Amino acid sequence: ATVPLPAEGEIGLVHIGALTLENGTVLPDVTIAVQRWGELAPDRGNVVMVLHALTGDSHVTGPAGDGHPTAGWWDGVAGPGAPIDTDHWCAIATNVLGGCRGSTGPGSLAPDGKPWGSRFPQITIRDQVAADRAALAALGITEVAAVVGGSMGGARALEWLVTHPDDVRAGLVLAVGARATADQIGTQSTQVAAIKADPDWQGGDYHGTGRAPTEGMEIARRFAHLTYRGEEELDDRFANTPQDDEDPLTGGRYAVQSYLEYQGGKLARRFDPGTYVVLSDALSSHDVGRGRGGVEAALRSCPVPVVVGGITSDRLYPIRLQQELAELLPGCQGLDVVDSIYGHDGFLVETELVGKLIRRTLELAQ
Amino acid sequence: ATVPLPAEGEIGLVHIGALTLENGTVLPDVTIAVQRWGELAPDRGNVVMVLHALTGDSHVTGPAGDGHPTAGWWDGVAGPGAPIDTDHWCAIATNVLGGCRGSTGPGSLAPDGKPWGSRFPQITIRDQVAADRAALAALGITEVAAVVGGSMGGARALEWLVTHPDDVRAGLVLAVGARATADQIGTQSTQVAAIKADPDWQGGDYHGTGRAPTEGMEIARRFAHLTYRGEEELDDRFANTPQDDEDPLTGGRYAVQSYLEYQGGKLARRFDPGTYVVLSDALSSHDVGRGRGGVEAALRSCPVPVVVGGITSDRLYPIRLQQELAELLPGCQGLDVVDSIYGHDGFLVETELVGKLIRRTLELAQRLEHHHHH
Ligand SMILES: CC(C)(COP(=O)(O)OP(=O)(O)OC[C@H]1O[C@@H](n2cnc3c(N)ncnc32)[C@H](O)[C@@H]1OP(=O)(O)O)[C@@H](O)C(=O)NCCC(=O)NCCS
Ligand SMILES: CC(C)(COP(=O)(O)OP(=O)(O)OC[C@H]1O[C@@H](n2cnc3c(N)ncnc32)[C@H](O)[C@@H]1OP(=O)(O)O)[C@@H](O)C(=O)NCCC(=O)NCCS
């Protein structure tokens, strides 16, 4: 028999065996964590793959419960009558390859019984697509109706569409470019440098030592969070106001500073530094044109119907990038402009508008 | 009492004594380092104050040498017939209060004989103006024809205009806003956090230990440098290209990564981390409206003729902030746009465009000084 799907909402661990990675390294004994919502159709033809971003996991939707400290990262997107209507669709999400919430990553044990750490291979977005395709195949699923994702999830979705157009009926590519830009690599590589600068990094082999480079990751996340915001919205929310009763003139904090310190600590309580490094390097690797004659050739090659969404105020994946995708993907009918003040984080915060784009995508999937 | 100006181009150390700071802390025995180009007129009416930005110093113009690692940060701006025409003007630049290039800052010795370090007071942009005014007063200078500056130097210029309008004829305020924004405080406070996270910070008292938080300041500087760039120009320049023959798919560097590493190292060879912290916190403190009924009231009642410059691609001080300054300052005729792909760093790179804004500011100041009697 195939590997059974987990019960609705529960985590299933799908063992896919060795994975030959794009750089030629063979990564042995890979496990991919899966969650799903909705029944799989008798014909197995109704799967909607939900692809999480840098710090997301398989927990797309649902409340904080046992195993899940917080609500789903796209809470409400999948369910009865929801944008992914689970009365008709089977929503499946993995924890990405390199992750820390059930899938093989740097904190996982290597063959030698020690955490991978510094021995974890450099993975690409294409390696993440291969791990997900292999997990689905083990569950008896060889094609999907659609792929949906924003940010790193949009890079995963775009590689899935360009690499395997015969095995996807439609896609949502939201708030990403065709390749990593210089600014993205610059902030990603410097975020990684902040983690590696922390003396508790221990060369990436901190797993199990009782010390971890959480301080360097909090620094990385504070800078990333600024890239995720709309500049004007951030100033309208916080301006130069002090935090509560503190006096910045005598060494107290500003409200925006306190908010960033809080965002850092929240990530430190739920996310592994080594995964942050591996997935940041996979984002820097992103390039749908590699080995295919460049981005224009690779996008023009892809005939799949695609909804391309970009956020007007996005500072990290500026809308010029989504205009490029919309112009070159022949299955794209035009750029869907998400006119939002909330920056790149609009892909998480604008649930109503992102849900509209998901409904359009699932119409194209038929 | 009156101290002489240094010889042209050379450093002068002006001792101004105690300075009462905005937060009420007294900073004893302050020294301000000064460089000048051009003669001081007998009537002392021809002074152009050049106000440096975060990592700048008093070396506005001229070559590397006589203790300067590199050419002036605005090399070419001052000279015969140049945008600051030293045949007519006396261009004076200080090293800012809190600096590490001759002025009193965290690396300087406190009265107890140990570096200020963690004991260095929190200073504001207004403290920086007050120190520079005191350095001028010690040199016998009470009136300035013009203040000119970009970035932190624009914050200094704008506070000078608003605080001392009767003692400035005109100003150039380039690539800054009326107050620090949430984004600027976010990146400045996080840069400071990257320095304080470095175990060699030693609470700020690393000076003279033989250890320094250069690694954390390099991280800070790499993030700052991205804020200073034009996004499109950075992608056209480097894209996702690898550095030389390195292979990023097996752990090598990208070109933009190598470039950022290089920029951080260059700062670590010339600049003090404690100074980076003190001056970044001074930028976060910028607010021309504080104690003045807010930014709109403060700028509306400032009568000084002002040229406001903003750079189209600036991601750190976006052009909406200079549109705001140009609308509110009654002496501003309209925003002067610097059409540049180089982001915030345009204030340093676009020498011809910035030079034209300086020359216009000083043609304005010369007309006004002819009609100013003191
Ligand atoms: C919550 C979210 C959906 C957007 O909201 P937000 O911008 O965080 O705004 P909120 O005001 O709700 O702030 C959330 C928290 O900030 C806290 N907060 C607000 N102002 C604060 C201040 N001045 N100081 C400290 N904490 C503050 C609130 O207490 C709240 O706490 P909680 O989340 O634990 O309940 C956020 O998760 C998001 O969109 N960004 C995350 C990006 C991400 O996860 N990336 C990884 C993959 S990209
Ligand atoms: C003045 C300034 C803005 C000029 O910028 P610019 O003329 O556009 O120059 P760039 O930003 O392209 O820098 C070129 C340098 O990068 C180096 N470089 C370029 N590509 C590189 C790469 N892939 N790897 C490594 N180094 C690289 C060059 O070798 C050159 O080095 P050099 O300056 O020692 O000769 C720049 O010197 C600078 O950023 N420093 C001033 C200080 C500052 O921005 N802030 C302080 C107060 S705001």
Describe this structure in words.
The structure is a homodimer. Chain A has 366 residues and is an alpha/beta fold. Chain A has a single domain (1-366), classed as 3-Layer(aba) Sandwich (Rossmann fold). The first copy, chain A, contains eleven helices and ten strands. In chain A, the strands form two sheets. The first copy, chain A, has an eight-stranded mixed beta sheet with strand order 1-2-6-3-7-8-9-10, with helices on both faces. The longest helix of chain A is centred in the middle third of the chain and has 16 residues, at 182-197. The interface between A and B is large, with 52 and 51 residues. Bound molecules: coenzyme A (COA) (2 copies). Residues 53-56, 151, 228, 243, 255, 258-259, 262, 266, 345, 348-349 of chain B line the site of one coenzyme A.
Keywords:
homodimer, 366 residues, alpha/beta, Rossmann fold, eight-stranded mixed sheet, two-stranded parallel ribbon, 11 helices, 10 strands, binds coenzyme A, transferase
Concise account of the structure shown:
Two copies of one chain form a homodimer. The first copy, chain A, is of the alpha/beta class and 366 residues long. Chain A has helices spanning 125-138, 152-163, 182-197, 214-228, 231-238, 255-268, 273-284, 295-300, 319-328, 346-349, 351-365, and strands spanning 12-20, 26-37, 47-51, 78-79, 84-85, 90-94, 144-150, 168-174, 306-311, 336-338.
